[PDB]
Amino acid sequence: LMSLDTALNEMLSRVTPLTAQETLPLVQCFGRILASDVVSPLDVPGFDNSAMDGYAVRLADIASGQPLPVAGKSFAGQPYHGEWPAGTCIRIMTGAPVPEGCEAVVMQEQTEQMDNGVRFTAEVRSGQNIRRRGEDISAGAVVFPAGTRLTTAELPVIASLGIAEVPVIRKVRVALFSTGDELQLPGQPLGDGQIYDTNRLAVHLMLEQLGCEVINLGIIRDDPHALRAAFIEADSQADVVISSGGVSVGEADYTKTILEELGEIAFWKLAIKPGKPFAFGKLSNSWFCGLPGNPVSATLTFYQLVQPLLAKLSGNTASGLPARQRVRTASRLKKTPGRLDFQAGVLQRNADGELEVTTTGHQGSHIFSSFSLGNCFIVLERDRGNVEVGEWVEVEPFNALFG
Amino acid sequence: LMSLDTALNEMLSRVTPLTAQETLPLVQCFGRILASDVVSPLDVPGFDNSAMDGYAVRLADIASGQPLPVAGKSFAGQPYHGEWPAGTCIRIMTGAPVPEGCEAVVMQEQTEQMDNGVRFTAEVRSGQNIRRRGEDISAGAVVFPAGTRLTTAELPVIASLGIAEVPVIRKVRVALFSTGDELQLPGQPLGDGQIYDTNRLAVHLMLEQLGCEVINLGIIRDDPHALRAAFIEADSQADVVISSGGVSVGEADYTKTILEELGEIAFWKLAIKPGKPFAFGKLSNSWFCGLPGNPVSATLTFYQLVQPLLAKLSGNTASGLPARQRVRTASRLKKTPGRLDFQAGVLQRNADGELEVTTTGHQGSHIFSSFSLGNCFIVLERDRGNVEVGEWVEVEPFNALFGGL
């Protein structure tokens, strides 16, 4: 009854990104969100240099027309010192500094090398094949803006500018608990109507891999006072609080009354498959997210709702959510109009190099295995019905959380 | 002269995965290699349950074709161990223990409540909607092979089996350094032709994201005692050793004479671009990877060769040269036959949703132009020349390391 998208944006419009920052050495900023625009201390490149292996010339000399002896050679790591007489060129290598008074570089493959000179015949435009100081980064220039997530792509660039450390937004603190007598810890006899609690583990893993900082409170004892205390404990110390399962997502019970006691909190019936319900709202100093019980629904939910929430919340400017790709099926697909169906696919290249998807086999909520077997989602459109082979189809690869 | 593929093979063929293990609780197992086949000590599910919101029934009450009332309710965490008289039915919820002596579960889509009990508007057969115990997972069955890289797919399922912990292969330890009187750290100025030392940082970061223990000995001084000592220390405490640059990648100097003392090292001239020189070989107690000084080439060699080696060394049986898709160019591309060119570029949706690739622009070799402008590698065939707009081309999206997946 609610489009995933609508749900998402309401979530995101209520949410203010963290601002508390801390300064760290680059080596510790993997995954981390720039707190402040980084600015260049230096010009990149630092000095005018040769775009090619060729020869440094002055337009005057070219016009003269005669072959130009080589008076010297500038290299990557040794500029040409000393006399550069009219009538001569300087042999130059890609990257090497252009000598004092140089008007142009001529790629060697435009030239004839001879007894007593380099013979130039192509017109030479002033400035050709020189890279001018700062043309790739001027000093003073923003190089990565605040809100950039830091990666092997950025951090060495920053190191290259002589920068030892940068300010990043502080990790998001996220507290985690489940509740329910059914739930059992690994080790104990599986009791009567009892099962091993796996959602908490799942959510823990994804939180950490999302660069969050998890305060895992564990299974709360089947009791209002115990539960109430846990909400207080968590909202005192964290930005986000997640019920991984047990706490009502609409169904009336003491859990529900404690939520409506401690906060203003929605219960949404999302139009998706798998799963449906989701709780979200504001505790005193935290956002609350309650996942359904069922392992699949919980997972899909966390990954499609909570991930983004945290991403915005972290200070990250870009969507943390991977991008999607139009592609064809190598498999008939069942889909009922009504829900936004996230089914598992195998995205892989076919015989002719073409990328295609393949159903993983059975796709219920009573087996979890279609996250290992899968390597991507197949986001079939809400209204869209069944899907005969070779159809255009939206595909969303699994990020790191699953491999 | 030597093809990227050949070099890769030489390396891995020599290499022997770690078998040393440790056993950790599941929550500490992300990205970690399973040492031992995970064997299921119990059945999932653990007692025969129901598929649907319906009624546990029989075939000698349904033999009656009579309206049958409700004796009790079986629930998720409240299984029914109650009287269930002769002519009655048991309310059962989706997922719950089939109660003693039960034969089938009906929906309420085939059922209505009358004054005198629940009457059934469809056929009802033995096995219907009772999930067998252990039909998903049989007890004593292998769930996850030894060599699997544990992830958010595997760990909760293992947890579904009451297992708190698993054996994994210990992390690969990697020693890192660079050397040369050129190299300088942040903080300090630039002794005429000095430069800042990025390769090490770059590599240190990647290794960690690959789940290694990094032993980073910084920039070694340009002195044979410093350098030899660094090598000995390194080799003694690690499984791999990597000069991020400074060490000979083939040129005749005092680092080279050390390599040949301490190990059997080969100096390779790869048929690639950017770059060429690369060093691989066994030391006393570790493997040595020597990266060329040029940063763009150091980074490209690590990604394309060293990463795979670490994968192998790790235990991970997932044979892994990361994925590559055949896409159209939005850009002209300069390219010389004879070398396999890793150019960088920009994978992105066009109007129609089908992917395309633009060049970064290309100016100088530059960690900017290459990574952080590119979101992928445009990998061009060795035998190929120049590409105009809309030739087919191979592309290899950057991974986590460059913020890709």
Swiss-Prot record, chain A:
Cofactor names: Mg(2+)
Keyword terms, alphabetized: Magnesium, Metal-binding, Molybdenum, Molybdenum cofactor biosynthesis, Transferase
CDD domains in the cross-refs: MoeA (cd00887)
Top-level taxon: Bacteria
Entry annotated with the keyword Nucleotide-binding: no
Pathway(s) served: Cofactor biosynthesis; molybdopterin biosynthesis
Documented EC number(s): 2.10.1.1
Protein family membership: Belongs to the MoeA family.
UniProt-listed NCBIfam families: Glp_gephyrin, molyb_syn, PRK10680.1
Functional note: Catalyzes the insertion of molybdate into adenylated molybdopterin with the concomitant release of AMP.
Name recorded for this polypeptide: Molybdopterin molybdenumtransferase
